[PDB]
Structures are given as structure tokens and as C-alpha cells.
Amino acid sequence: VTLPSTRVPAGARHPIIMLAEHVADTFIAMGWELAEGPEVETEQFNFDA
Amino acid sequence: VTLPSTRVPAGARHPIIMLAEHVADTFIAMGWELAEGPEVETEQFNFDALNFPADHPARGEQDTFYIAPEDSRQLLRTHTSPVQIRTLLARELPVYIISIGRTFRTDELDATHTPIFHQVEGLAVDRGLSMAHLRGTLDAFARAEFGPSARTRIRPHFFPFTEPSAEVDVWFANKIGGAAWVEWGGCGMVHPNVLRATGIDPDLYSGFAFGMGLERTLQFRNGIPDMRDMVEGDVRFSLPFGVGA
Amino acid sequence: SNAMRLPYSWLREVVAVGASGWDVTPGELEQTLLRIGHEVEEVIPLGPVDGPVTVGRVADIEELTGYKKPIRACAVDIGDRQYREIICGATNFAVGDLVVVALPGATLPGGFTISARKAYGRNSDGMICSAAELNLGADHSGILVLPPGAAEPGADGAGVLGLDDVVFHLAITPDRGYCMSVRGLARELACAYDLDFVDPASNSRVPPLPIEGPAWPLTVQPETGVRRFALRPVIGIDPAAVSPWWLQRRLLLCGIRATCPAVDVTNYVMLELGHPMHAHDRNRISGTLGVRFARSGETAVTLDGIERKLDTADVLIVDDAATAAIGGVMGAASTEVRADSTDVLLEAAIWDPAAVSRTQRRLHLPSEAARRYERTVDPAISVAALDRCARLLADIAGGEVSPTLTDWRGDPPCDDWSPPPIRMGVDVPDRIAGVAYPQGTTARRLAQIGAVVTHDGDTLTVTPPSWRPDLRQPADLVEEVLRLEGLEVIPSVLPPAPAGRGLTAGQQRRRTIGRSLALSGYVEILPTPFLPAGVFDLWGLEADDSRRMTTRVLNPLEADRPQLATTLLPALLEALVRNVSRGLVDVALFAIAQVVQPTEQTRGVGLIPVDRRPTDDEIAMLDASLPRQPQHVAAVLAGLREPRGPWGPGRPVEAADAFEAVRIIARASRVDVTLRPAQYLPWHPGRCAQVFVGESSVGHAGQLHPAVIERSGLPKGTCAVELNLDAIPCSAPLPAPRVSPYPAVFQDVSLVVAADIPAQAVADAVRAGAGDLLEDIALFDVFTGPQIGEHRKSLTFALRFRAPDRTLTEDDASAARDAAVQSAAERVGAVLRG
Amino acid sequence: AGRGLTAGQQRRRTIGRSLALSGYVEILPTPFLPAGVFDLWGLEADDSRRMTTRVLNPLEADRPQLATTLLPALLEALVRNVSRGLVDVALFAIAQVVQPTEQTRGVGLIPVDRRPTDDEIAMLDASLPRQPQHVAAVLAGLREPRGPWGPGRPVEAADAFEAVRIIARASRVDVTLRPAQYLPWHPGRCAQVFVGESSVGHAGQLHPAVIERSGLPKGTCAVELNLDAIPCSAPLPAPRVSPYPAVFQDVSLVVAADIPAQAVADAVRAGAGDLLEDIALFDVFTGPQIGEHRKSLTFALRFRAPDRTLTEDDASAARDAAVQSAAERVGAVLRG
RNA sequence: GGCCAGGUAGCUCAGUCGGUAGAGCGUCCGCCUGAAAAGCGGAAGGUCGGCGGUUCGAUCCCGCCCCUGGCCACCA
Ligand SMILES: Nc1ncnc2c1ncn2[C@@H]1O[C@H](COS(=O)(=O)NC(=O)[C@@H](N)Cc2ccccc2)[C@@H](O)[C@H]1O
Ligand SMILES: [Cl-]
Ligand SMILES: [Cl-]
Numbered sequence A: 001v002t003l004p005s006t007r008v009p010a011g012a013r014h015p016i017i018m019l020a021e022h023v024a025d026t027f028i029a030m031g032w033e034l035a036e037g038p039e040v041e042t043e044q045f046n047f048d049a
Numbered sequence B: 001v002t003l004p005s006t007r008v009p010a011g012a013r014h015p016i017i018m019l020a021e022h023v024a025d026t027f028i029a030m031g032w033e034l035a036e037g038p039e040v041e042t043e044q045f046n047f048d049a050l051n052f053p054a055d056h057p058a059r060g061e062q063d064t065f066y067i068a069p070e071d072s073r074q075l076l077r078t079h080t081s082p083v084q085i086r087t088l089l090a091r092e093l094p095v096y097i098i099s100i101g102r103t104f105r106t107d108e109l110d111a112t113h114t115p116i117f118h119q120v121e122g123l124a125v126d127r128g129l130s131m132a133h134l135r136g137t138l139d140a141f142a143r144a145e146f147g148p149s150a151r152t153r154i155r156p157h158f159f160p161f162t163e164p165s166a167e168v169d170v171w172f173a174n175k176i177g178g179a180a181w182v183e184w185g186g187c188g189m190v191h192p193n194v195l196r197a198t199g200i201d202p203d204l205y206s207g208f209a210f211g212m213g214l215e216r217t218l219q220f221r222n223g224i225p226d227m228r229d230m231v232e233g234d235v236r237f238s239l240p241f242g243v244g245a
Numbered sequence C: 001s002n003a004m005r006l007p008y009s010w011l012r013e014v015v016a017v018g019a020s021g022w023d024v025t026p027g028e029l030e031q032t033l034l035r036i037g038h039e040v041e042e043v044i045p046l047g048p049v050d051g052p053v054t055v056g057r058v059a060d061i062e063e064l065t066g067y068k069k070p071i072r073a074c075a076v077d078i079g080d081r082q083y084r085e086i087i088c089g090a091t092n093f094a095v096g097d098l099v100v101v102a103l104p105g106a107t108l109p110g111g112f113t114i115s116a117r118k119a120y121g122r123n124s125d126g127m128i129c130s131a132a133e134l135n136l137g138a139d140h141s142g143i144l145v146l147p148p149g150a151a152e153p154g155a156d157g158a159g160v161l162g163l164d165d166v167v168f169h170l171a172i173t174p175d176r177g178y179c180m181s182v183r184g185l186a187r188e189l190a191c192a193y194d195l196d197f198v199d200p201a202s203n204s205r206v207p208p209l210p211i212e213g214p215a216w217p218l219t220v221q222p223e224t225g226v227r228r229f230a231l232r233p234v235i236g237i238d239p240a241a242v243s244p245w246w247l248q249r250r251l252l253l254c255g256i257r258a259t260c261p262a263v264d265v266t267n268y269v270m271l272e273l274g275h276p277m278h279a280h281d282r283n284r285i286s287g288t289l290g291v292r293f294a295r296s297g298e299t300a301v302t303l304d305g306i307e308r309k310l311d312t313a314d315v316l317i318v319d320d321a322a323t324a325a326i327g328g329v330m331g332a333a334s335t336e337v338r339a340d341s342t343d344v345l346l347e348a349a350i351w352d353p354a355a356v357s358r359t360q361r362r363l364h365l366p367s368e369a370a371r372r373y374e375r376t377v378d379p380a381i382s383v384a385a386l387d388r389c390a391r392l393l394a395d396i397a398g399g400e401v402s403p404t405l406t407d408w409r410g411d412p413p414c415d416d417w418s419p420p421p422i423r424m425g426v427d428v429p430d431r432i433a434g435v436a437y438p439q440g441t442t443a444r445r446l447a448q449i450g451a452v453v454t455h456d457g458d459t460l461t462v463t464p465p466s467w468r469p470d471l472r473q474p475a476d477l478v479e480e481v482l483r484l485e486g487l488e489v490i491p492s493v494l495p496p497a498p499a500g501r502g503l504t505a506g507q508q509r510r511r512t513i514g515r516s517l518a519l520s521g522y523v524e525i526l527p528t529p530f531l532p533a534g535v536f537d538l539w540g541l542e543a544d545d546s547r548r549m550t551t552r553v554l555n556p557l558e559a560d561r562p563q564l565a566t567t568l569l570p571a572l573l574e575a576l577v578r579n580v581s582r583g584l585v586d587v588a589l590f591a592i593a594q595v596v597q598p599t600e601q602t603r604g605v606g607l608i609p610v611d612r613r614p615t616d617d618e619i620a621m622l623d624a625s626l627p628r629q630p631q632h633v634a635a636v637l638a639g640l641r642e643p644r645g646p647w648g649p650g651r652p653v654e655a656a657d658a659f660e661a662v663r664i665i666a667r668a669s670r671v672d673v674t675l676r677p678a679q680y681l682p683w684h685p686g687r688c689a690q691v692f693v694g695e696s697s698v699g700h701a702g703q704l705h706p707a708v709i710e711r712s713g714l715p716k717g718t719c720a721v722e723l724n725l726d727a728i729p730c731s732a733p734l735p736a737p738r739v740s741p742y743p744a745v746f747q748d749v750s751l752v753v754a755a756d757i758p759a760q761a762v763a764d765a766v767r768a769g770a771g772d773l774l775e776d777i778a779l780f781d782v783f784t785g786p787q788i789g790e791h792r793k794s795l796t797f798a799l800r801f802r803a804p805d806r807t808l809t810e811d812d813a814s815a816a817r818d819a820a821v822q823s824a825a826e827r828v829g830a831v832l833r834g
Numbered sequence D: 001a002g003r004g005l006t007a008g009q010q011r012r013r014t015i016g017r018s019l020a021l022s023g024y025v026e027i028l029p030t031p032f033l034p035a036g037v038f039d040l041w042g043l044e045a046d047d048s049r050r051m052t053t054r055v056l057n058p059l060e061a062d063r064p065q066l067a068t069t070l071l072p073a074l075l076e077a078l079v080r081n082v083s084r085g086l087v088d089v090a091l092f093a094i095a096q097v098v099q100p101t102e103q104t105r106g107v108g109l110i111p112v113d114r115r116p117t118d119d120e121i122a123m124l125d126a127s128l129p130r131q132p133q134h135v136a137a138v139l140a141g142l143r144e145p146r147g148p149w150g151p152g153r154p155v156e157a158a159d160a161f162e163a164v165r166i167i168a169r170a171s172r173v174d175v176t177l178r179p180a181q182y183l184p185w186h187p188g189r190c191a192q193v194f195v196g197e198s199s200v201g202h203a204g205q206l207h208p209a210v211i212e213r214s215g216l217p218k219g220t221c222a223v224e225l226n227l228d229a230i231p232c233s234a235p236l237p238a239p240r241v242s243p244y245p246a247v248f249q250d251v252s253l254v255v256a257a258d259i260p261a262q263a264v265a266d267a268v269r270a271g272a273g274d275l276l277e278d279i280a281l282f283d284v285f286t287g288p289q290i291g292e293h294r295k296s297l298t299f300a301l302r303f304r305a306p307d308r309t310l311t312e313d314d315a316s317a318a319r320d321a322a323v324q325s326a327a328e329r330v331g332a333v334l335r336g
Numbered sequence E: 001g002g003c004c005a006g007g008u009a010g011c012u013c014a015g016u017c018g019g020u021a022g023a024g025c026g027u028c029c030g031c032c033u034g035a036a037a038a039g040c041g042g043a044a045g046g047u048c049g050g051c052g053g054u055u056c057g058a059u060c061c062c063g064c065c066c067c068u069g070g071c072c073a074c075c076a
């Protein structure tokens, strides 16, 4: 009964992503919400504003 | 490229549990927390601290499962409302909790009733809480589970553990026989005797509570007219809902 | 009977005494009633009828003989000296009776056109109607007979029967006993419509009869809970008198069958005013009337004739001879009024609500009286209801009301029945509502419901009326204001909740376990707590297996299944045969749910007073009295684990699938487990693992024993797992891996061991000897060919070595492998394969 | 009181969870494409993936192009892991790409002493390149490791199709797969993935020349889907569990070898109607009894009525209607 | 707790007032097919809800009891 049993081993989400998920849960539980923005951005919003 | 590729087909969590998960997330996102309580409960928390008189007919053996021997004052809990008591005894104020779990009654089976079912309890106790806050919470609950096009209505009623007391109906389009208002759950301001039974001063704190059927919520949400497949555990009922929701 | 039924016309009449001309549609009335807190169960219009439905008088009856039933051919006077012959099969009428006939051309509800028909060799010009066929009431199993003088022959049936009416069935909540009557419901509607209310129980509507001396003698035992007990006689009534149609009609519409004036009047006044009344044949009374408790074994025969087994908490009314009534539940046959009763003693009593409720529920007699008494009855109106009854009976039945009166009001006599006053701040309902009501609203609403209200600054002193014993604290007064103003005005405001902590670790782990099992192909069931009959005998457990120590339900669903589950497997296995029995042969189920495991202190804790917080010791005692209720997770599998498809024929369930389920749960819980061979029913003793987290046992998995499968009707090869989630510690690992940039070395090692050595114990021995350079070990071969001796096996493991700071030589790895082989020799007796 | 995670936010978690449970390891992929990757793939000069946003001052002078596809970064990460001893590898990523259009250019400074008007807000957003969320995966080596149970299973194109279905189940949508030609995939082991009739991506085995020219392992397979083109969905099922027994029958149909098995099953469903509870392919046969360029498929059928027990002749009628539907839609011949 | 109808195969039901009890679908086998299903042919399978009694023998008669469906009743 000790023989290996896992025919397709588990993978893994990246620890940075799992930590983000846990940080999001922390703030949602306080009533806050998760806002988004794109990675390529205008100078207007990254600097001027 | 269209050949079947799923060598181990997915299963499914039960839709009642997936609905519970979604209700929980709704309240956690509002800052509330999820409280728990046992299924075998004392009479002290299921009836007495909730302001039921000693001879209240819901206490009889025709209405309530009792644990042997004759007067152990133990039972299968008949609503999730004893968790109000456990919560006010265990936590410091203010308190904002829901509780979801199984409840037990000696009820005949019909399209909207089964002996072993689930409820969503809510309890908020704080300075200055009003019926307007009860209505706000109930509207957020209904809006998240049924959408904004959901017809609800609230009318005065009675429970030994609230005063004032109210019931909430949902317009149920697929009700066996023809659409009609069907009761969704009960609610009210926590009775002052309930606060006193847990050491809270009714002159400083007020509270509201509610208790909705979980299977009943699923019936309204998915338009399932008869709850008994939901209860009986045939794989064919659960698989259509998917491994997650 | 069951709910509060009454016809709109009666309700309207009582409302209209103070509000002349008041009239609303039934749609509007239903809405108003729901808004102020009265559930409308049914709105039932009477009729309807069209065409020639009229009153007739039966002028002759010819018996038709020789049929499977007695049949009457009837000459019926239908007015203007016009007579019609009508065939009718009922028997509950005689020549001279007023009946209702539906002549040809008439339409009865629902949609039955009456045409002339040939019935039993005779022609019938229509039919004599029953109450059900007119949609007037439920049947008496015969046709409807109006009392003499209700109407002349030829009168319009719909007018005479009042078929325009509508009957409301209300489900009144238990805190509103005063609404079990026309009086209380009329009062409520006057509140909702801001009408002036004339109380039908007031002295101006029921003026006091004379009191010149006492009526019958009465003793009342102490501590029976009787609050009031009044008696008045009506002497010399005509026993041939019957109640007028208007009274019989209102009883019928309220769900009460009329019998004789004396009984009819008591039921009528009960419905009107809310005070149950009882009529005694005063000449069947022997001696002093007394109310006392029953003795053990005492029986009494109720007026319906059934022998009631009585109990010592039950309150009786007895005389010298026999029991006269079960107090506030049912009268006894000994003093029932009969077809010969001439002198009647009317009883207006107020019983103890809890006592009536206890008694009526045990005996299963939820009479009209009992369900009013158990919700409390206004003690202020006892003599008014008595005087109403007496005057009405003397008018209907030709009596004379006797000017005597026994009116016991307790010892000492109570003469003010109002509850104690309640102090409440004038703006308390506003705060509870979240609404600023116009100034004076609270004082105005509280006066409408009958309270006396006085003002002192911002404080009201509010004395409820005697029919409102439910009004005891400020919150009760708040409910009165809020419901009459309507809940629709209360706005919808989400409370700011403080910042919560979200899901607990345990709640989060339950989600992850369930999602992972589901993804792996398991279907969740919500298992019943009630164990199958004799399940542990079917499993073959020894008599002292801990699983047998179960908690027992006194009054279970199925008398054969009283025991609560110490294990989830019996319910999962039952769900498996259900699915297999319905054509789903390849099945994998799981459940996450508490079990119930009693112990020593698992017994009772007496009632703690609820006027205070239980002390911390009382809280901990309560919790220690309950059975342990740990969360468990379990799964069962049968049939194919992997289905057939274009790739091949699919793989049957085997034990290792149950072992893999353990590892899915462990990975979901982020703990490491070890499996060790174990013997433990109901598993196969050679295919069972005990599951460990560290050195603590958390459950078992593997294939079920062939005899359990056999005795339980399970599919061959069924496997199972059950773990105690509460015994799995809540881990929160914080890894900090460092990745070596240097290449690994790969070597394999073949070791021969005794057959009973677990493979994992060899891998543990190899890892203990190899040291830090060993990055990974994996078994890829178990071999038992002829090169290998009997009861021995050869194991070959793939080894991967890697250093953090250097490239290795083969000799570096070989030295680690060699130390691993020595460690395997010393721990499990391994021999390097040669 | 907040509203918690959005549907898109919840769905990204669910996809992540599911792929990791299925054996995939997440990488966070660099947005800077490898030098000349689309030349190594052999892409047509007008392939939309070549229309890249460029960084003026990148980390590596030869890698200024921002990724229009996640596969180059995942494949580079695959080579990296394989080069360090881990030859059996499955990796995924969930990340935005950068896809410029015509209106992808500069917007002059707007004074910050006031709110930008709604027209300026929209012009700023319209001037940025499109940045949709993609999900992608790559696999090579053994999909299933060896062990006591035998020697383990090499990655194959069907593993890439299963990754699509893992994602679709996580997203709670149905997908169809159709044969397609689309570099860098092998033109004979490539599926285009559809939700409804909207294309959302591609899956299968990579082309052997792409593998050779990029130094990838033989047999590398891959998936890439556009998450933002997969619609949200909130299914509200209401099953009814028939208490009556079912009927089991099988059916063998011969079609031209190019007919997809799923188009046959769909034709069988179409013809059979409501009694059909389940259909499952379990045999594809191309031996000597079957003509050249044809194939025999056999499906297990389960029929069941909601209100009665069926006879064998009731199921046979439904099967015969299915057979006729299959002849009419895919030219199937009942096996003889 | 009341009333009505019931409990018979793995599922859905017919039936029988003393010695054989069943059908549709589900299971197994032979021919058949590369392997299937259909078709043709042939099997297995029921303590006729349970425990006592009567009887040489009980699904069927007598007693006690249990459960299921429906319609009521009750109620947090
Ligand atoms: N037998 C049943 N089967 C399935 N669902 C049920 C069953 N009985 C009740 N329910 C559902 O549970 C809801 C509430 O049940 S209730 O008996 O009416 N009332 C209660 O249990 C109260 N404890 C609710 C409450 C009231 C006020 C404050 C807090 C909580 C109902 O509205 C139904 O939705
Ligand atoms: Cl050997
Ligand atoms: Cl061919």
C-alpha cells in the first residue's frame, strides 16, 4: 500500500501569483475591490496626472 | 483533432455547496465573516435563549428530532439560529456574521420541503442598527443571488427571537401550479430577550438577523420546481452544474 | 378545522358600524391584510350562479323503488303556484322543507349547465342542490335545507344564499390571538384605514343584562390557572327551534356546522367576539360546579363520544356525578344540550393558555375553543360575551334570560385586566425604523391599537389593552407602529461593516479539498446522518469497535435507523448503490461533513435561566455535554476509474485509486502523509492503508473486504477512503528554495528485499543513506522473476544527485549511492541486486 | 460594501488552479520577444503577430519587440528548464499581450489642472495598443512519468487538446475544435479552438522545422487562447432525474477519413432526439475491412425516457433516425 | 398526528385470497463482428417489506410491526 500512486504529478501556480491572490483576499474581506490597468500606458497617467 | 481527449472526466461539487460558497463570498466582500455551529445542539441554544416558551409546539417530538435518552435536552438543530447565540457568546461586539449549514426537522417531503435541509443565517449587532440596515443587507443578498430583475417583497410576521419580525417572499415563476410569491426566509430585529440572554445591553446595541433556505434559494435562482432531486444524491443531478461554479 | 375563516360581508358589517359605507374590493383587502401582518391563505368567492336557481318547498315525496339506491321523485313549489317534479337521491329532507333548486337554463359553478334530464324512468325539471354544488360550503353529504321562514318559494337563490360574498382564510400568527375573531380583524382594518372603530364587545353594543343574584354554585381549585369563570342561565327554550338562516349561513362560511340554537349561538359569539362559549343543559348538572385537575388514569367521554385518556396536568369541569368538560378543550356528553334540553347554563371561562395548549396537543383536539385559548382570550369581555349569547339564544329559541350571574374573577377578585404600563421614548420607533415619522405617529398608532398613552417629555407611558398580552416591552410597541405605517417606507441602507478577516483557514481548506476531488472526477453527495440498519453488523465490526458507540435519535425518520453516523462511509456506500442501481455503473463519490462521536459526559444540562448570560463555566459545560462532531472527508469508487474511449478500454477502479485520493486531499491540505499497511474493517486486510500525518493517524483507505461488499450489495472491487479533517493540522509552509545552476548525475539502484517490506521504507532507507546530494528518488520497477527467490522482490529506483556549488563526478554519486545501499541493508535488509 | 472579485478575476484564478492541478507549472513570461522568433517560426510576412509594438531602449538591443503571443516566452522558458535536467515539462502562463493597430500612436499633453474630458479619456485609451489577456501552455517529454505501473506516456497533441478542455471547463464554456493550418503548429496536428463561432486560439503539436530551428525538444506541443474573446457565462441548469431504466445500444458508422469524429457524434445527436441521454466514441477502426481513406467509428449510446420504460424497438427507432441523420450530414454508411 | 392507496427482480410496474410469480428495460452466454450493437437463440437473478402464529406446506389466512406515495394537519 506504499507504492507510488500519482500518475500525473501536480503542477504549481507561481508563488508571486499565489501571494497576489492572498493579498487580494485580504482586502476584499475588508470591502475593497480589485482594479486593473494595462501594462503599456500613456505618459499622461504614468507621469503627468 | 476532435477525438475525445478527457481520459479522466471531471466530477462536480454539489450545487448546494457551490451556492453556499457564492453566498459566503458575497458577504465576505462586504466585510462580514462566516461563523459555524454543530449539527447536534443543546436545547438551551436552539430554543431557550432564542426566547421560545417552554411549551412552544415546535419543541414537541412531532416537530423536532431529539437525542436519546428521554430528556437529554439534546437535539438535531431545527434552524441555524442557535449560531446567533454561540456567536454573541463567543465574539466581542460589534458582530457581523453569516452561517450556512444543515438543519433538521420531522417534516413531510413536498416540492419545497425536505427533512434535512440547509439555511443561511445572518446576524449583525452594533450601535444604531435599524430595519433600514436589515433591508439593505437583504437587498444585497437577493441582488447577488437572483439579479436586479428579482421580485422580492417583505411583510410583517413573527418569530420568538425577533421583534419586529418580517418574512421575505420571492416571486417564483416555475412554482408547481403556476407562478406565485414563495417565502424565501425570515428576518427581524433581534428580540431584547435574546440580547439579555447573551449579556448584551439592548439600550446600547441593536441587531438584526435573518434565516433563508439554501435549497429554496437554489430553487428560485435556477428555476427548479421540485427540490427532491437536489436532495437525493443522484450523480445525474450534480454533473450538469460543473466541477466548479 | 385550522385557519381563521370569515366572510367579507360580516367583516365589512362590523367595520361599517363605525365607518358607515366602508367597502373595498377583495383584491385590496388581501393586500391591506398582508401589509399589516396577516397572511391570507385563500380568497374564495362564493358561487357564482346564473339563471333560474331559486328557493323551492318540497310539497310531496314519492319513493322510487327497485334501484341500487333509494331515490325520491319530488314535487317542488318554485313560486307563483308553479310546481316542478325533480328527481333527487338525497335523504336529508322531508315534505315542507325549503330547498334550493336549479331549474333548466341554470348554470352552476363551475360551468355546469342544468338541462332537463331523464333520471330513473322519470323526467326531472332540474335538481335540488347541495351546498358544495352551489359553492357555498363543504357538503353535509345531503342537499341544502334552509330553516323554515328563511325565504318564500321562488325567492332568488343567489340573493337568499348571499352568493356575492367572498370568504377569506387567514393564517394568524400566534402572537395575535385577538385576531381569531371578527372583532379583532375589524379592529385591525380600522387601524389600517384610519377608521373610527365601534367595538362589538363594548357595553354600547352589548348592554349589560341584570345581575340580581348568583347563578349556579361554583368552586375553583387553586393554581388551575383559571382567570375568569362566568355562568348565566337561559330558561324555557323551545327545543324545536332552529337557528335563523343568517346565523347558520355565517357559521357555515366560517367552517362550523350548525346543530341547534344553544350550540350555534355559542359558536357564533365565539367567532364574533373571540371568546369561546359553552352551553350546558342545566338540568343534567348535579350539584356544585368545580374545576380541578384530572387524576392519573382518569378518562372522560367527550361530546363526540370518544373516551379520552386524561393526564394530571389537564383541567376538568366536573359536578357531583360526572366530568362536564375538559377545560377549554371539549365538552363532555353528560351535560351536552340535546333535542330535549329546555334550561341552559352558559359558561364564559378563561383558561390558562399553556395548560390548554399542553392538553389539546396531547389529546389531538385542536378545537375551535382550544386554539383560541392557547393564544390567550381577552378576560375583560367574558360577561359581555355571556350576555350577548344569552340575549341571542332567548331571542332565537324563545327563552327568558334569567337575571342571575355567577362571575368568578379569581381570588381575590380582579377588576382591571390591563397589562402593566410600558415606558418608551417617543422617537424609539423612528430609530428602529430608520424613518422620521410625522410628529405624533407613535402616539396615534398606539392609541388606535387600544393602548392608553400619556406623555411626559420625550417619554410615553403606554398601557396596552387587555386583548394584547403580547405587548410587554418597547420592541412590541415598535412593531405595532412599523407594521401599521407599512414596511415599504423603511429605506434600504447597507450597514458599514468593519474590516473582516475573511474565510478561516479551515473554511478555505474545505473549499480546496472539494474543488480538487471534483476536478479529479469525484461527485459530491450530502450524506444523511442516519446510519443504515445494522450497518456495523454487515461490516462485521467487533462488539467494542469505537464506531459502534453512537448517539441515538429518539424519534427518527425510519424507526430502524435511529443511530447518528460515526463514519461517512455507510452513507456514501448507500449513495453508491443508488447510482449503480440506476444505470450509472462507473461511480466516484465524495462527502465533506461532520460525524457524531459521543463520549462519557455526552448527556444533559438543565435549563439555565435566560434573563442573564450563562457564565463561562456554564458555556463550557454545555459544549462538553454535546458529542464530539469532527469534520470528515470520505470517498468511494466502483466500476471503471477511467472510461473507455478511442485510446483503449479504460481502467477498473483499484486500491491505488483510493490511495491517490488520500494524496489529492493531502496536497489540497498542504500536508505530507504516509500510508502504512493496516487491518481495519471494512477494508480488505491486504489492501488497506492507515494514513498518517507525522506520527498521528488520520484515517484509512483501500479496497473493501469481499464479505462487506457481498453482504452490503456493493459492486465488486469497491474502494473507499475516510479521513478525519479535524486531525489534519493546519499547515502554512513558507518555502525558500535555492536553485542549483550545476548539472545533475543520474544513477539507478536495484535492491532485493523480503516481499513484505514496503517500497516506501526502502526509499526512506535509501534517502537516509544518500545524504544531501540526493535530489530525487523514484521507483520505476518491481520485479519478481525467477532470478529472485520466493517471498522476495527486486526494486529499482531512479536516483538524481545534484550539488549546490559544484559539478559532480560519477564517483561522487557512486559514493552516495553506496552509503544508501548500506543504509538499506541495515534498515530493511536489502541486498544489492547481482 | 464591496462586490468582491469580478467574473474575469474569479475565472483567471479557476483556470490557474485547474492547470496547476493538471500538472502545469506557471511561468511569468517576459514581454520582450526573442530575436527573430517569427523568422524561426517561418511566419508569412503579413502575419498579424509580426505587427509588434517596439521599445526604444530595451534590455537587449536585439529584443525590442513586445510580444503579440505568449508562446515565444513560454517556449524559451521550456528550453531553459529542459537544459537544466528537467526533460519532462509542462508550463503555462496567463498574461496580457500587446497588439497595436492603426490608431496606436501618441496623444499630446493634456493639462492636469482639470479633469480630462470623456472624449480625451477615450482618445487616450484608443491610442494604446490592444492588450488582451491570453492563456498559454507548452509541454514536452513524458506527460505521465514512469513508475511501477509501466513506462509512462510521452506528450502528444491530444494532451494539448485536453489542456484546451481543462481551460474551457474552468471557464464554464463549451468549445469546438476544428482542423487548421497555423504556424508554428504542425499542419496535420493543429486545432483551431471555437466558442460558438468565434475563434479563440489554437492547440496541438508544433511543426518539426520550428522545433529544429528553435532547439526545442522533439514532439513539443502547445496551446494559446485569447481569454478576452471567451465570453463570461453563468449557467443555471435545472436537471430532472428520470427514475426509469435506460437502454444501451452501440452503432458503427463508416465515414471518409477526413470527417471529424465529433461531427459524426453531432449528427447522431441531431437525428436521435430527446431519448438520447449520452453518446461516447469508443472505437476507431481502419483495418482491411474498411476502404482506403475511410474509417469505422463505433459509439456507445444511452437512451432514456423521462416518463416511461422504453422497449428495444423504441431505442432502435431513435438509433435508425440517428443513422439517417449521419448519412445526410457526414455521408456515414451503417457498418456492414 | 388523521385519511386513502400501496411495498413483488438491478430500475418501472402487472398479478396472485395455500403446493409454478411474470413483463419492459438492466445482467450473463452462443451464433455474429477486427471488436461491438441490433437481430436470432439461450441462461442467471425475488428470503413477493419484517417478525411471530396457523398449517404437512404461506407472497396469499391470523396477529404485531416497519416503510413508501398522495391528500390533509402542525410549525422556528
Ligand atoms: N423542511 C424544509 N425544507 C427546505 N427548506 C426549508 C424547510 N423549512 C424551512 N425551509 C426554508 O428555511 C426558511 C426559514 O425557515 S423558517 O422556519 O421559516 N424560519 C426560521 O427557521 C427562522 N429561524 C428564520 C429567522 C427569522 C428571523 C431571524 C433570524 C432567522 C424558509 O423560508 C424556507 O426557505
Ligand atoms: Cl533473491
Ligand atoms: Cl469502406
Ligand SMILES: [Mg+2]
Binding pocket: B062, B063, B105, B106, B107, E075
Ligand atoms: Mg414541521
Ligand SMILES: [Mg+2]
Binding pocket: none
Ligand atoms: Mg406519510
Ligand SMILES: [Mg+2]
Binding pocket: B157, B158
Ligand atoms: Mg411563520
Ligand SMILES: [Mg+2]
Binding pocket: B163, C175, C470, C476, C479, C480
Ligand atoms: Mg409583536
Ligand SMILES: [Mg+2]
Binding pocket: C810
Ligand atoms: Mg554515467
Ligand SMILES: [Mg+2]
Binding pocket: D248, D312
Ligand atoms: Mg439489449
Ligand SMILES: [Mg+2]
Binding pocket: none
Ligand atoms: Mg422496487
